[PDB]
Amino acid sequence: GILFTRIWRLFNHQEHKVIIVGLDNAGKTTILYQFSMNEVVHTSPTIGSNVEEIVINNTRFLMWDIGGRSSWNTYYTNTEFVIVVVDSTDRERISVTREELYKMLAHEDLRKAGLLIFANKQDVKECMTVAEISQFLKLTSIKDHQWHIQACCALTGEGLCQGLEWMMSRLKI
C-alpha cells in the first residue's frame, strides 16, 4: 500500500545489498513483486548458478533457492541483510531451511548482516505458528547477528511493512 511506499522510498535514499533466500515455492518471487510495485526494477543475468539479480529502486537483491553452493560465497560480502523466506505450511522441509541457514551464517563474509525471517503463508490454516518456526529454526541460538522473525502473507503484503521497518531500525542504529 501507500504506507509501504513511503517507508520503502525513505529506505532507498541510500543504496543497499540484500540477499533473499528460501526453499523453492517459499514465496520469494511473490515478495519481490510486492516490493516492485510502483518502483523501478532492473533485472540482470548472473554467471550465477541459479542466483538472479534484481535491483529495485536503490536496493540490489540477490535471490536464490536453497535446498536444491560454493557459487554463493562471492555475494555475501557487503550484504546488509539476509532475508530468509519460510513456507509456514511446510513442516517436512523446515529442517532443510535450518540446515542451509546455519551453513550460510558460518561464512565470515556475512558477519555484519542482519537476518530477517519472513514466516510466509501465515494466512493458511493449520500452518506452523511464528513461535514454532522460531523454535524449529532455533533462532535464539543466533547470538552474533541481529534477527527478527516476521509473520507475513506475500499475497496481500501483510507483514511486509513491519519487516521493512525492522530493517530500517537496524540500519541507522
Choices 3-11, 41-49, 117-125, 164-172; region in contact with ligand G3D by CB under 6 A = 117-125
C-beta of 29 vs 146, nearer to ligand G3D: 29
C-beta of 14 vs 95, nearer to ligand G3D: 95
Distance CA 85, CA 150 (A): 10
Interface positions, 26-85, toward ligand G3D (CB under 6 A): 26-30, 85
124 interacts with ligand G3D by CB under 6 A? yes
Distance CA 120, CA 154 (A): 7
114-120 and 81-87 beta bridge pairing = parallel
- Cα atoms found within 13 Å of the Cα of residue 73, Cβ hemisphere only: 7
Amino acid identity of residue 150, one-letter, is Q
- Least separation, in Å, of the C-beta of 146 and ligand G3D? 24
C-beta of 27 vs 114, nearer to ligand G3D: 27
135 annotated ligand binder? no
37-to-32, 40, 154 alpha-carbon distances in Å? 9, 8, 13
| Per rule CB under 6 A, count of chain residues that contact ligand G3D | 16
Query: What nine digits make up the cell of 18?
Result: 540484500
Amino acid identity of residue 81, one-letter, is F
Tell which residue, 11, 5, 153, has the closest CA to residue 89: 153
Residues annotated within the binding site for GTP are 22-29, 65-68, 120-123, 154
Annotated binding site: 22-29, 65-68, 120-123, 154
Which residues sit at the interface with ligand G3D, rule CB under 6 A?
22, 24-30, 85, 120-121, 123-124, 153-155
